[PDB]
Amino acid sequence: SAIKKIKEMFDAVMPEDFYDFWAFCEELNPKNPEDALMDTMGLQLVGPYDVLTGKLDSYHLHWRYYYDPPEFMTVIRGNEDQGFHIGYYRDEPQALPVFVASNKAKVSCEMSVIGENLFSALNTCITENLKKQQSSLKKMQTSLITKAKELQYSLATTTPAIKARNKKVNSKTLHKAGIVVPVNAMDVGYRPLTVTDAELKKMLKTITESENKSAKDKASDELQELLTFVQFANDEGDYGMGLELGLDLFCFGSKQFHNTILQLLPLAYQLLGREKYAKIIQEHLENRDREKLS
Numbered sequence: 001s002a003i004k005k006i007k008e009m010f011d012a013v014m015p016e017d018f019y020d021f022w023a024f025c026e027e028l029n030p031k032n033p034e035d036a037l038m039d040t041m042g043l044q045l046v047g048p049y050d051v052l053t054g055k056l057d058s059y060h061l062h063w064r065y066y067y068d069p070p071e072f073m074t075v076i077r078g079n080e081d082q083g084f085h086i087g088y089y090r091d092e093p094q095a096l097p098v099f100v101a102s103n104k105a106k107v108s109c110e111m112s113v114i115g116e117n118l119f120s121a122l123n124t125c126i127t128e129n130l131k132k133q134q135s136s137l138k139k140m141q142t143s144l145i146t147k148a149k150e151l152q153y154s155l156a157t158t159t160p161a162i163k164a165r166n167k168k169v170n171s172k173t174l175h176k177a178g179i180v181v182p183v184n185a186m187d188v189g190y191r192p193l194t195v196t197d198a199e200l201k202k203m204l205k206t207i208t209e210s211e212n213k214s215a216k217d218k219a220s221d222e223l224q225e226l227l228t229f230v231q232f233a234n235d236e237g238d239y240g241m242g243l244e245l246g247l248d249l250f251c252f253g254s255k256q257f258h259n260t261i262l263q264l265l266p267l268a269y270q271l272l273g274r275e276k277y278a279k280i281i282q283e284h285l286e287n288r289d290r291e292k293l294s
Contacts, residue, residue, distance in 0.1 A: 017117035065105035070277035091180045093276040109251035111177035119148040120155045174251030181240035190240030243268040
């Protein structure tokens with residue numbers, strides 16, 4: 001019913017597990033469906049779910065944490081010291097999400113895939129809370145499993161479709177969740193970075209944490225050489241390279257690179273027909289550390 005709401009407030013269509021998960025949490029907590037997971041695992045529905053709860057009346061930045069790339073849209077918040085949260089990852093603004101992933105934003109840029117849908121996502125969290133109160137949690141585990149059975153949502157952490165998409169990933173990136181861009185019959189559309197990911201981090205750490213000066217100038221020159229390679233790539237149609245490098249600089253997290261990122265990712269997303277993600281990366285870096293709550 002609020003499909004139309006979310007379509008105009010956010011620029012997105014949510015998959016059916018989004019709505020089915022909500023309804024699962026009404027059953028649990030009719031008063032506050034967004035808080036049904038709180039007493040047992042410290043998790044609260046946020047982002048697109050907030051429109052249903054009433055708290056919302058661009059919204060690209062609503063609960064976007066520090067390392068959420070434009071493809072990531074948060075829908076559940078957890079441990080605040082970790083920055084633990086759960087979102088839908090979406091290679092293409094116009095497509096549905098390809099999986100659900102978690103991030104501990106205060107720990108790392110890295111994304112953990114916990115299934116195709118929020119039922120499998122929650123299923124993973126329930127396993128861990130139970131691994132390390134519990135009598136009440138086991139009975140939620142049971143209702144989740146049967147409800148997911150009914151609606152035939154896989155509870156698998158990696159599904160055949162997730163594995164199928166991983167064979168189309170051009171690069172895992174620093175976040176390890178992968179980019180997917182077209183490649184035509186002449187192999188145009190993507191080319192790799194000329195450094196490994198480990199060399200890339202060593203380079204960027206030198207640029208940002210170093211006193212040697214010549215080493216910083218050297219690494220700054222390597223990075224400038226990368227930007228020139230990206231330049232040839234874009235001229236030659238291999239737009240995935242700039243996307244990879246931009247996302248990688250975003251993932252490193254140094255606010256020093258926001259300007260380079262803004263040379264890479266807005267251009268990359270427009271060249272790829274992913275214009276909405278050019279919007280989000282600009283809005284996000286405009287003010288990246290803040291109160292996330294709206």
